[PDB]
């Protein structure tokens, strides 16, 4: 079973409560704090001890976060701890943001090129992708010298490759096959 399989019930419950009560931004901050705090070298050790009870592990994590957890978020941490799932907090935060992004019709697109592209080109790629996908696009542009020229677009599981490296690979496979 993948960590994503185990985190799905919890991320979905947290998302539906946050959505129904208009708290989407509060839970986004709370789950992000819990994901970061539970990954700390001292907290990671404390959560794995065999002598501590589920409620002692939950209270220790709530006391450390304090100000960042409202009554519903504190109740959620006590629920994750009772079911012995505190190791899933980083995955629960990741899956909550995916449900939020899909609800808010938003897409984060990674982009890579051989050498830098202008704002005029980024805004031309952004309107083209937003018109194709029917979503708000956030271009995380970057460079990779492994490309001989052109650009590669990664809109989640969808990939659009217009780079020269991809064309050279197609030719190598065409001649070798």
């Amino acid at each position: 079973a993948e960590l994503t399989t185990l985190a799905r019930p919890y991320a979905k419950a947290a998302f539906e409560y946050a959505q129904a009560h208009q708290q989407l931004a509060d839970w986004s901050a709370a789950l992000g704090v819990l994901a970061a705090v539970s990954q700390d070298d001292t907290v990671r050790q404390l959560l794995k001890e065999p002598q501590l009870t589920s409620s002692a592990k939950a209270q220790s994590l709530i006391d450390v976060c304090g100000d960042k957890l409202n009554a519903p978020a504190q109740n959620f941490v006590r629920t994750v701890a009772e079911n012995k799932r505190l190791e899933l907090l980083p995955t629960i935060a990741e899956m909550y943001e995916q449900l939020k992004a899909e609800q808010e019709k938003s897409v984060e697109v990674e982009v890579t090129s051989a050498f830098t592209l202008s704002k005029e080109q980024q805004d031309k790629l952004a309107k083209a992708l937003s018109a194709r996908l029917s979503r708000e696009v956030r271009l995380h542009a970057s460079e990779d010298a492994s490309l001989i020229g052109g650009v590669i677009i990664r809109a989640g599981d969808l990939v659009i490759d217009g780079s020269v490296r991809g064309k050279l690979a197609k030719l190598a496979e065409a001649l070798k096959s």
């Binding site: 704090v33 970061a36 002598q51």
Partner: protein, 79 residues
């Protein structure tokens, strides 16, 4: 990134440091024992329990050590 006020709260937490040569029993069943924390134990090493009982280390996993009791296991307990 975790905040400086939260990092200060984390430095104050009651987290017990454990020596690399010591461990705590998690479970006992039919002459097989599971132990938490023996960080420097070797495969095939002799493990010393209270009341003069010895074990042998057979399973070295990420989170725990599996040991076979070299005598009578009914006197061994969790913790």
């Amino acid at each position: 990134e975790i905040s400086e006020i939260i990092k200060g709260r984390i430095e104050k937490l009651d987290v017990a440091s454990q020596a690399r040569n010591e461990g705590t029993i998690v479970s006992v069943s039919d002459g097989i024992v599971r132990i938490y924390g023996l960080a420097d134990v070797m495969y095939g090493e002799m493990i010393e329990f209270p009341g003069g009982v010895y074990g042998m280390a057979l399973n070295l996993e990420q989170d725990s050590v599996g040991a076979v009791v070299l005598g009578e296991y009914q006197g061994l307990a969790e913790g």
